[PDB]
C-alpha cells in the first residue's frame, strides 16, 4: 500500500533546469523525510540529500549543494528536487526514497541533458524465417528505431506473450538517437495461426505503436557427419560402441565405413537410410571395439561417401577425450 511514484523521464536543455516529483501514498507523508539518490548509468550511487516534510528540515550532500533544491508539498503529499543549470554530467537516473531505512523506493526518473529534441521511435518488424523451416520454433521481433530520449517500453501481445521474450538494451547510434530490438521465440506451429504484435511505448514523445509482425510474403544435399563416443553407461561392458551419425543428405545413396590407423576397422554395421521429417535422410553407423582400445585413446574415424561431398568423400575422427 506504500508507494512512491516519480515523475516521467525527460530531456533537458543544457543550462536548463528540471523539477522531478515523488508522490507518496500509503502512509502519513509527514512521518518520514524523502531522500534523493542520483545513479549514474551503472557506476556508484550518490546520495543528494533529504527533505523532511513536516518540520521542513533538510540536509544536503555538499556535492549537490547548489545543483539541487529539495522541497515538498504536504497537502499534495509529494516531494520535489529541482536540478539547476544541467550539464551532461547530470544525465542520470534520479531516485527518491523514504526514511534513513531506505526500504521504499521510487521507480526513478531518467534525466537526459541534451540540446536534441525528443523524437518518437519507428517500429519495424523482424519477420520469421518460414513455416516448418524452423521445424520446431522460430524467431520474430520488432525493431524500435531512431527515437529519443530514453526510455521506450516494448511488450508482446499486450502483456500476454511474455515467455521467451527478449527486449535488448537500447543503443546510442552515431546519429544521436536510440535504437533497440525486441525478439521472442515461438513454435513454427503457431507461426501463421497465432497473431503476434509488439506494443511499443515511448512516453517522452507520447507515441504508442503496435506493429504486428507477420510471416514474410514468400536436388542433392551434402550429408552432415557427426561422431559420438560411447554412452558412459556402456563403459561398464567390455567392448564399447562408436557411433557415426550422417544426417541431412539426399539422395539416399551413401557409403559409410570406419578405420583406425592406416587400417580399416572391420566390426561395424550401418543402418539403412531413414527419411527424415525434412525430406533428407540420415543413418547411424556403429563401429564396435574393445573397451580397452577405446580407452587407450586410439583414434577412429568414419568415412562417408556421397555425391554431394567435395570429393564424394569425407572423414571425421573420434577418440577418447582427455577432459578437464
Amino acid at each position: 500500500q506504500v508507494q512512491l511514484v516519480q515523475s516521467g523521464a525527460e530531456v533537458v536543455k543544457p543550462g536548463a533546469s528540471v523539477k522531478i516529483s515523488c508522490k507518496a501514498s500509503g502512509y502519513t507523508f509527514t512521518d518520514h523525510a524523502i531522500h534523493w539518490v542520483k545513479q549514474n548509468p551503472g557506476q556508484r550511487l550518490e546520495w543528494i540529500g533529504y527533505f523532511s516534510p513536516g518540520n521542513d528540515d533538510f540536509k544536503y550532500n555538499e556535492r549537490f549543494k547548489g545543483k539541487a533544491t529539495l522541497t515538498a508539498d504536504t497537502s499534495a503529499s509529494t516531494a520535489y528536487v529541482e536540478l539547476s543549470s544541467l550539464r551532461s554530467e547530470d544525465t542520470a537516473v534520479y531516485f527518491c526514497t523514504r526514511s534513513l531505512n531506505m526500504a521504499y523506493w521510487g521507480q526513478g526518473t531518467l534525466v537526459t541533458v541534451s540540446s536534441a529534441s525528443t523524437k518518437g521511435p519507428s517500429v519495424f518488424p523482424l519477420a520469421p524465417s518460414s513455416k516448418s523451416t524452423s521445424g520446431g520454433t522460430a524467431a520474430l521481433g520488432c525493431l524500435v528505431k531512431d527515437y529519443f530520449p530514453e526510455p521506450v517500453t516494448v511488450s508482446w501481445n499486450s502483456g500476454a506473450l511474455t515467455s521467451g521474450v527478449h527486449t535488448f538494451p537500447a543503443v546510442l547510434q552515431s546519429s544521436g538517437l536510440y535504437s533497440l530490438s525486441s525478439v521472442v521465440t515461438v513454435p513454427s506451429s503457431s507461426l501463421g495461426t497465432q497473431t503476434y504484435i509488439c506494443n511499443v511505448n515511448h512516453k517522452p514523445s507520447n507515441t504508442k505503436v503496435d506493429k504486428k509482425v507477420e510471416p514474410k510474403s514468400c536436388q542433392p544435399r551434402e550429408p552432415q557427419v557427426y561422431t559420438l563416443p560411447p554412452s558412459r553407461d556402456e563403459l561398464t561392458k567390455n567392448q564399447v560402441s562408436l557411433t557415426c551419425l550422417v544426417k541431412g543428405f539426399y539422395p539416399s545413396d551413401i557409403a559409410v565405413e570406419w578405420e583406425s590407423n592406416g587400417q580399416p576397422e572391420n566390426n561395424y554395421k550401418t543402418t539403412p537410410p531413414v527419411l527424415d521429417s525434412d525430406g533428407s535422410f540420415f543413418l547411424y553407423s556403429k563401429l564396435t571395439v574393445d573397451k580397452s582400445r577405446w580407452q587407450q585413446g586410439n583414434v577412429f574415424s568414419c568415412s562417408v561417401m556421397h555425391e554431394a561431398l567435395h570429393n564424394h568423400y569425407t572423414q571425421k575422427s573420434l577418440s577418447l577425450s582427455p577432459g578437464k
Binding site: 557506476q43 527478449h166 547510434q173 514474410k216
Partner: protein
Amino acid sequence: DIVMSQSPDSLAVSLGERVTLNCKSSQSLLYSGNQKNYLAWYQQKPGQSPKLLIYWASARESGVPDRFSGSGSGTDFTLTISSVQAEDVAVYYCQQYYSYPLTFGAGTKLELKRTVAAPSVFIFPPSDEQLKSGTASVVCLLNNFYPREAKVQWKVDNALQSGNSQESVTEQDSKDSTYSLSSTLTLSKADYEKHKVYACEVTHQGLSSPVTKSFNRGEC
C-alpha cells in the same frame, strides 16, 4: 566522508554454491552508545529500484529469504548467501547511514555459472517498410548462450564489414541463466541494394566451429 569498498568487483558462482561478499568502510559504523552497526545491504537488478535486504549490519528484512545473511562489525562487514539460486543474480550494494553524506560501495555483481550453452543463431533482413524510409538495418540474434563472450562478424558479398554494427546484450536470465545478443548492421538503402550476399558469423565457446546464418538480397 566515509568510503565504502566492496569486494570482489564481480564473482561467478555455480547454482547452489555459497557466496560471501565483502564491504569495508573507512571508519567504524559501530555506535558506542547502542552498540549498533549503521550499515545496510542492497540488492539491485538491472533498471530497478534497489531492494533493502539487510539493515543494522545483520537484521534481515521481512521478506528476504534465509539464504541471505549479514554480519560484521565496525569497519568490516559481509553479506553471505548460503546456497545461491538463479534469482540471486544481481548487484549487491552496501551503504553506511552512520553519518552524512550517506555513502555506498561500488557494489559486487553476482553472475551464476550454468554450463556452456551455445548460441542459437538467426538473421533478419530489413523490412520493406524500413526500406521505404531510405535505410537498411540487418539484425542478427544470438539466443541464450553462456559465457557472455561471443563475437559477431558481418559479411556483405563475402566482404568483412567494420564499424557499422552495434550489439546489445541482455541481463543474464533469471531462470536458465543465459545471455542473448543482437547485432545490427546499419547501412543506406542505396548501399544495401548495391550489394547481394548478407552474412552473419557467430563465434562462441560452445560452438565447435564458427556458425553462419545468412540471406541474399533478392531471395524470398
